[PDB]
Paper text:
3,4-Dihydroxyphenylalanine (DOPA) decarboxylase (DDC) is a pyridoxal-5′-phophate (PLP)-dependent enzyme which physiologically catalyzes the decarboxylation of 3,4-dihydroxyphenylalanine to dopamine, and 5-hydroxytryptophan (5-HTP) to 5-hydroxytryptamine (serotonin). Because the enzyme catalyzes the decarboxylation of other aromatic L-amino acids as well, it is commonly named aromatic L-amino acid decarboxylase. In insects DDC occupies a special position because dopamine is a key precursor in insect cuticle formation, eggshell hardening and is involved in immune responses. In this study, we determined the crystal structure of the typical Drosophila DDC (drDDC).
The structure of drDDC was determined by molecular replacement and refined to 1.75 Å resolution with excellent statistics. There are two protein molecules in an asymmetric unit, which forms a biological homodimer. The fragment of V322 to P348 of both subunits in the structure was highly disordered; therefore, they were not included in the final drDDC model. Each of the two monomers is composed of three distinct domains. The large domain (Residues 86–380) contains a seven-stranded beta sheet, and the small domain comprises the C-terminal part of the chain (residues 380–475), which folds into a 4-stranded beta sheet covered with helices on one side. Based on the above features of the structure, drDDC is a fold-type I PLP-dependent enzyme. The active site of drDDC is located near the monomer-monomer interface but is composed mainly of residues from one monomer. The cofactor PLP binds to K302 through a Schiff base linkage to form an internal aldimine, lysine-pyridoxal-5-phosphate (LLP). The carboxyl group of D270 and the protonated pyridine nitrogen of PLP form a pair of salt bridges, which is structurally and functionally conserved within fold-type I of the PLP-dependent enzyme family. The PLP pyridine ring is stacked between residues A272 on one side and H192 on the other side. Upon superposing the native drDDC structure onto the pig DDC structure, we identified a flexible loop in drDDC structure, which did not superpose well.
Residue numbers in the entry:
A (entry chain A), B (entry chain B): 1 to 321, 349 to 475
Write the structure that this text describes.
């Protein structure tokens, strides 16, 4: 394919994307086609000769779209938002043309320097401590990782190296294997499975700390640390979760961070989803204790309109664990510029207010109860009574094909989750979604 | 930003991308700007109000391009190609609009089903043994991973789980932990650092097997295995490399495979770069022994024109280790359709021929010697004499700013590498790059 054909194809795809997203409320949330539908529709081998882009383009509605899950439909409540925005789509077109994966070491000023400045822009937006800002002139700064799962692992590895070095310095006679066998990390029992992943891949012990009303307390963390010290183990790392995946609960960073500092554990803050809200002054209280953190992560590619991948991680000392891989700073720059801070804050606030609106509708119905306090864009709720009736309700709702919801469970309480996902959501969607839940419950009751 | 503005912006970016790539020979391979150039060019904080897309576009040539490394310039010889093609750019626009990270498990027909068919399309193009193909009705099939590094780890983790489940049966009195501590894997001393990474993250011992003429022999692998068993260790995994990063040498898969088979080690084949050549019948002999492999991986995102990320991995039983994440199948489909088999074959062949051409020009200069047999798109060469005079030469060439080359070292032999990276490369580029090397050597000689 030559440039003129590329231009015709690409500009046609621009038209297609705008048509798709601007009219997304027309799409059905349950696919009409059955598993196995695709193979029949396309040949069994690649073509020997080049096909026409117009024919590929025609195959998008014919072959692809019937089998697509519409994540950006305001009728679709996935686990958390998947960011999409027009500025990020345009940046990624350019990154596609000029970036590399980073196999051959990227020594390029633009990739690296834009990443440093964008992490400062975003760090200022979050009012992060100066120690995390490159422009403060210290050791601190940030990197854009691919995922929060990667960020958690990277921080665990940095913490591991740091503890290794410190324990060696103090005991030159001990070998690495002996030191490494003693290392223990900590996280809440509500922490994401990526922490467990990180413990396994990092080759260390991980302790789950029992949370209180879904939130990890400093005293519980400290108790856990002390027990392991009494066993001769070496606590080295703890993950504090701001916005748990099950119910968007917040660990007490203002307790746990100081506990970690006091005991010389690296404190990593996983705020993958909820961290986007910290650009709003009214939600910044939720990361009180941030000064105690060794590393902090959130994903703009969930709730801050930056298409995947974009997981923003700051460290007090970035060296302990590089830059411009994939030119991810380009989409971050485009979004921050073409939205501006005000519009991004408006986006967070609108979503919080929508979740509250839905929670108010829900609790007004005496058949239902919240399963957790409402936080951020997430409402956890259930019919009063049994788990099985709730399992039934969720099944019925998803089967009716007007909206989609997802379940979760915390210690024997099964509940339904409504997360605000689509950037196209409006308040009337909350009314629509609630009325659909209620209508489904009405139907269950009247199954005699 | 709304759709009409998005369309104006995106279509202007399409114009920009075509202009950039189609005239990429105009670009200087050495950045003119110095480190630190970027910060003074842009504001120190995000804008409160949204900016205009036109001002962002203006800033691409003003702020970004002065500091960009032009990976796709035919004057730039990085470690290996970074795939770029127009069909893949257009696929990624759509994927950006409709795909998700996979946080919420994609239960989506199109994403999953397209991945299966494309891996069969591609597996046929490589003439992989029927056992790796999903269309053969067996347990085998393929997944599109993000990187060869991830692929190698995933295979290691599968092999680990498989061995552990085997050893638990023959030693029901042994600890699970006792078994794990005994596990040992193998790779060539020329294998990529990603194998070491997999060993570390996989929590197993890894043995570097001494290569001969940069190639791992079956006997050397067997000797290392038997040595370890002799100390009560448990061999479980080996990586056979087809196209090493240093010199594009090929391990003896025909020897190593059966060695692994005999001693019950999972054999993973890392063909990340050179694997793209196996779509050509005349190069398929380089994976003789492929029947003996448990997994096989190469990256279309290096040498097969599929923009990152796209690492294609086949397994004889893919259940020892979740499809459709990021909808990577879409770009593979677009590339295979819009190039067709013949054009992709022609791409590989031209690059192999260009490398031979360059090698001929090099050896004709009696001051130079090849540092390895020419394979695929790579020539390894050096001035006869010291490593130090070769380091000077490389620095001199890169400093001259007409072409860019990279260095490598195999057991105290330092050498320069010319790999064909750019899809825009032409025959005369070989003459240009050779003449530049020779001119630098002249310029060096005429100095004392």
């Amino acid at each position: 394919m030559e440039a003129p054909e590329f231009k015709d194809f690409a500009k046609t795809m621009v038209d297609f994307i705008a048509e798709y997203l601007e009219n997304i409320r027309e799409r059905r949330v349950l696919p009409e086609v059955k598993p196995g539908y695709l193979k029949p529709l396309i040949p069994d081998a690649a073509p020997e000769k080049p096909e026409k882009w117009q024919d590929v383009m025609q195959d998008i509605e014919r072959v692809i779209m019937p089998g697509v899950t519409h994540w950006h439909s305001p009728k679709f409540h996935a686990y958390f938002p998947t960011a999409n925005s027009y500025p990020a789509i345009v940046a990624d077109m350019l990154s596609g043309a000029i970036a590399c994966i980073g196999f051959t070491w990227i020594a390029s000023p633009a990739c690296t320097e834009l990443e440093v400045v964008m992490m400062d822009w975003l760090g200022k937006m979050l009012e992060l401590p100066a120690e995390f800002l490159a422009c403060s002139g210290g050791k601190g700064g940030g990197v854009i990782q691919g995922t929060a799962s990667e960020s958690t692992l990277v921080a665990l590895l940095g913490a591991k190296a740091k503890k290794l070095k410190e324990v060696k310095e103090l005991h030159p006679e001990w070998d690495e294997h002996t030191i490494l066998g003693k290392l223990v990390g900590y996280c809440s029992d509500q922490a994401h499975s990526s922490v467990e992943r990180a413990g396994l891949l990092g080759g260390v012990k991980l302790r789950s700390v029992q949370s209180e009303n879904h939130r990890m307390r400093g005293a519980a963390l400290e108790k856990a640390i002390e027990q392991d010290v009494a066993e001769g183990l070496i606590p080295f790392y703890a993950v504090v979760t701001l916005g748990t995946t099950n119910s968007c609960a917040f660990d007490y960073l203002d307790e746990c961070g100081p506990v970690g500092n006091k005991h010389n554990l690296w404190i990593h803050v996983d705020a993958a989803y909820a961290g986007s809200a910290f650009i709003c002054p009214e939600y910044r209280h939720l990361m009180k204790g941030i000064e105690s953190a060794d590393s902090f992560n959130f994903n703009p590619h969930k709730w801050m309109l930056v298409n995947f991948d974009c997981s923003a991680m700051w460290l007090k000392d970035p060296s302990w664990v590089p830059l411009g891989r994939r030119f991810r700073a380009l989409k971050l720059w485009f979004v921050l510029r073409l939205y501006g801070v005000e519009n991004l804050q408006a986006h967070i606030r609108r979503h919080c207010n929508f979740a509250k609106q839905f929670g108010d509708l829900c609790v007004a119905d005496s058949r239902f109860e919240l399963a957790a306090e409402i936080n951020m864009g997430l409402v956890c709720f259930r019919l009063k009574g049994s788990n099985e009736r709730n399992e039934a309700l969720l099944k019925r709702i998803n089967g009716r094909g007007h909206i989609h919801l997802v379940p979760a469970k915390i210690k024997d309480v099964y509940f339904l989750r409504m997360a605000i996902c689509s950037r196209f959501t409006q308040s009337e969607d909350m009314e629509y979604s609630w009325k659909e839940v209620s209508a489904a419950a009405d139907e269950m009751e009247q199954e005699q």
